[model samples]
Target: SQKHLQINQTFEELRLVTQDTENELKKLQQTQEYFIIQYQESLRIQAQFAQLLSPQERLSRETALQQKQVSLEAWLQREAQTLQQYRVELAEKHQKTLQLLRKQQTIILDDELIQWKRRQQLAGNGGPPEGSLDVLQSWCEKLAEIIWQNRQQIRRAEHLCQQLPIPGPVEEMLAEVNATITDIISALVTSTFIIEKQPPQVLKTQTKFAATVRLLVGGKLNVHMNPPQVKATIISEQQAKSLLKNENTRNECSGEILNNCCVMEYHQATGTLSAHFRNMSLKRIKRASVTEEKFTVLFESQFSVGSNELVFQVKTLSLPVVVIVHGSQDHNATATVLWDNAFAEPGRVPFAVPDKVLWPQLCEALNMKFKAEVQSNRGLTKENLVFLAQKLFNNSSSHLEDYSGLSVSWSQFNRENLPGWNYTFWQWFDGVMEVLKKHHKPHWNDGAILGFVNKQQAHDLLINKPDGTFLLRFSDSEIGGITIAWKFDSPERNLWNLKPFTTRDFSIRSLADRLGDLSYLIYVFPDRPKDEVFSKYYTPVLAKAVDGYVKPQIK
Candidate 1:
């Protein structure tokens, strides 16, 4: 309410003060006028008295009038002086106010100039501006982008640091397994050690790694893990020449390296014994939008442009960096690759195995003896044959005693599970028994063998040719002490239930079924050619009695 009144009072006071000052000045001027008039009248009266009176009287009258006029003049002079002083003070105060306003204007201009300088400093314009926040905003934006790009790699490194503080026994066991395999491989190839790259694994992802191993094996083939053309390395012939001295010397290489060390330092191939790893899953927890997975690309021959096979091999085998999404905290997520060779024998290690390794030779000597006795009919005894069979077993060290108990005849052995066996020994005997059953043709009582044939047609194959057809009674003497024979063509009659080997009274033809219409019989013998044992003796005994009977169509 006071503020409202003050606003109203400003204008009112301005007008009121102007009117009051004018009215007061007017009153002072009027008094001065009236006094002037009174003084003028007194002066006239004095002049008249001076003229009419004597000297003493006229002088006294004049003096009195002069005193009154002097007093009035003194009062008017004092009032005038006071008014002039007030006016002078008011003018001086107004001038001082104007100077202060000018000073304030100058200060505002200086503030604006400072603000402009700050802007220029911040803009990088020779120290743009003091308070240029836009520069800070820009810097913050760029830093954020860089962080976003590398967030995964950073997080993974951080996680590794965190996990490194404490590893449990299960992790220790896993490391030992991998280390054991590494030690074996290292000792075999005479390398320093196997360096494995532990991949981070996610719970649900399938890390279907490549099926190839980059090894420095004891095998015969030496393969490069990298491409060619990357090295300015000299050719074999060029390197051996004197022209490459610049490439070899101290002035050239600036080190203690030898001139001829070019070949030694350049490249390493993915030989038989070398091992590498796959990229496991690792994702950045900071970036939910990431969809990238690191995968090692095989350096094909096509990548040889500007890259030498040696350099590429080294590069490819170099520890690769990868990012895994939601991967494991443990480094034991390594995959075990079962090298798919047939046996664990030391010498027979794949021909590509690198040389000078500590891995002992696989003792896999070929057994030509078992192959020989049965084939050559050299008549091998148990003692000699057992020695031969032992060749198929794991061999002992150089000073160890050789074992001979492993050998035995086919009849006494039931070794169907021999580790490296091609087939069991009894399979041969089973074939020979079938022919014994067929020999009794008509009334054959070879129970075990007879039950194997299809029940309905068992007797059809054994008889003589009937009145309308021809007959063939095939027979042969085998290389062994065994004889075999068979009859083909219709049987003269059909009869059942006859016994041969058990019936001391039975003859080959009297073995009992009548020579009915169907006729085809065969006798199998193992006492013949050992080579023909599988085909000649066995196959003929199991054939379908069919068309050619005229045609295969009559099965």
Candidate 2:
């Protein structure tokens, strides 16, 4: 009735009304009043129909409006959630920067103390023995050995505390530990001379801006990499002033950082350390860590200048200040002996060197060479730094979870702990491949895997040279590189563990996160898009899933 009632009459009237209206109206001009009534009746009928259906129409329209309103509300809620996550991340970054700045500022202050000591030495105080770099290196060797011996004592105290049962009044044990540690530190202060009892052979390294320090235990395997290497180089005070004003050090690499497989070799005459990558001719450094003595620097390609955390102190010394480069650190941060006006805490360096190639300014009584090694190492991975800030900076309800894919391949740790989680290269490869296939939803399934190669074939994939390794780096390997193709993927597949970042899972406390904090050389398989790489099987560290569930590698 509603559809046809008006339509047939309206269509029929329309057929003749337009053609006849002019002529008909002309003939009916005398009786126009009669036609007007007919037209009025038609209008009333249309109004009746519109009034009858208007409520139903309004109800349908309101239903549609309600659906739209609900969708908009959902979108707004999602947007609010995302906005909150960013605010939390920004806050975390700020805290991290503050903590790092404190550490950096302390290093600067250490340089000042070096300067003060040099001045005192020049002013008839017992200065650097023999006034030479060799002497300083020798001094570094001596101090490191003494520190090593002290470390055994220090470690004893730490181990005692770690093993102490929870119930006892451990205050007495703590006191004893503190006393012993304090005595050892006092001993370091009283005996500060570079007299190597038995120094390891100091190779004349060709690395510039590199500092050679004595090695202690674990020198064979894990060289100290807590404090960062600061390569000592000459920058005019005018130039330095310009730089201190800004936080970027784009041109600071007057020297390169050389990382030898075991120990980075340093030159005695010229502080040049020849850094050669075993697998690749490195030029740019991907990541690096430096300590007081032993420093690790990664490079992009073939490099000449070795990178070190070298500090230049202006000397009013017997021989201007000895600028002991290799990113020098004052050996007293760990020492409990408090110096007057000293910023020994990380990031409390008071003075900054302006113009001169200020030298290592300590007297011979003070260790002239900054000992590159301090056994107590504290490191913060990017994520750890992030975590530390989250703890110290804010009490946010937001959390993060990462999905990282893992490839099959055993780490050296697993190899040593052998037969436990060991898989043949191919076997491990297949499992990872299975993960990729299972988790990744291919958008454009050509079904043809282009240029994909199996494990045995990729074992020989070389970059700068032919080596059994293919840019495989896990955690902190001085050798392996980030071979995982890092650019975006067309059909990106993120598993439950290894995206570099994930903002979800803020509320989840996962065992996987805990084990990751602990040492597990769980293989990581990052996505690869190397045109030449036909990596059939890849291992990756997967991200935590949506529910903040991360199945532990060990468990």
Candidate 3:
């Protein structure tokens, strides 16, 4: 009877304590929520203030608001750390209680955690985002609550045992349970530090770039208190391999990064803790070759959790980046980026891509590249792809139908020069894409230009068409150049090609006006009159004589 009464008393006391912790957690949540709202409101107020105040008064008011914002931000930082301390303290308290926490912790740490890690790995292959941190945070919070509740129950049990000295395995069991709970919480805290954004895969030296680093468990852990600084360093492929093998390369870097360090900031509204590098630049590179070289920007940071109870050193590598110094080198550099992003197998050491990819696979990569470069919804047509395959295989007959099974080596793509050309295939294709983007987009979109047709194909089409019937095709002899192929009514009805027009010529006069100027070109192939097709785009008639003499026009 006495033991029963004591147990009841301790249970009641434990219930009261549990309620207290729950109330405190609620209060903390409300405080943070209100803080975020206020922060956002302050920003809105500043925008309004900007419109309402005079220059002199605005300066004074702006200074005052700035000070207030700094003060509030500092408070948020402090409060965040305080929240982390609370979470750790709650977890620590749970160690005193023995219950079945392993199941829930396993779900979060094993299943969810592993999925995030896998997504991060696949992200290097240009896969979709690994998802946001909100769901994970909610789970972590749930874990914290369960652990705390169990801990309070354990304390109650311990109190009951204390009141009536119980002998046996109860004390030993509680100790083991406490140790297990502590291990679980430790795993939770350590695994949540992650990189949110990766640096550019095709990084250009002496140019500004950006990335973002995040701590998934930062809010719950209160890590925003003493916002940690993250540093980015460019390491070569060899160094990256060594890093993964657990070998210390002693912080060696293959290149220098300017403004690479960024301090983490907590967004109250989004509940995200991250460091955004808005203007990080690669200042110089120290490479060993002219061949395509790959490197990764390693982001690293050190931060303590639970009031310095544990200090975590977290690091993540960006997707492999190909560094180029000059604009001329960008085409090949992009080729390297495209190949890796498309065909790189997940979990490969550093960055290993298949040296030769299937023709169809390469086609897909090229199509994606072309569309993105042109910033258009239109992609390469099947005929365009066939032309590419012909160029790649050096097939003069053009009779091969299925290129899907054929393999194209890296040499054919970018490394070696195309048969008799000075530049490689990628250089030529990229140049055509550039020219199309700058001057020929309208014509290309309107079907007035048949871009991928070669010289022979163009001649074949126009040879049988009416006299003055012409077709526009990409140039075979010049990079980033286009030409007109037309059948002229001469003594022999020969097919004629005008000199290819380049970006320089197009900049001075649009393709439409040029077509309008050449009276011999009467139709746009297949009997579509040039006037009907290109008149809308011709420069408006020069306002009849422009002041004195008629404005001289260039044909």
| Clashing pairs counted in every model | 75, 94, 1
Regions of model 1 farther than 4 Å from truth = 1-386, 389-400, 403-550, 553-555
Root-mean-square deviation of each candidate, in angstroms? 38.7, 39.3, 21.1
lDDT of 1 by residue, 53-123 (tens): 67687678778767876776676567545444433333333233323333332332233323433343222
Estimated TM-score for each candidate: 0.15, 0.19, 0.69
* Cα lDDT of model 2 by residue, 292-337, tens digit: 1121121211111013322221111011111222322222111111
TM-score of 2: 0.19
Instruction: Please report how far candidate 2 places residue 209 from its true position, in Å.
Output: 12
TM-score of model number 1:
0.15
lDDT of 3 by residue, 225-329 (tens): 899998989999989988889886577788889998889999878767888999999999989744378999998888886567667778778778888777677
For TM-score, candidate 2 versus 3, the one ahead is: 3
Worst 10 residues of 1 by lDDT: 333-342
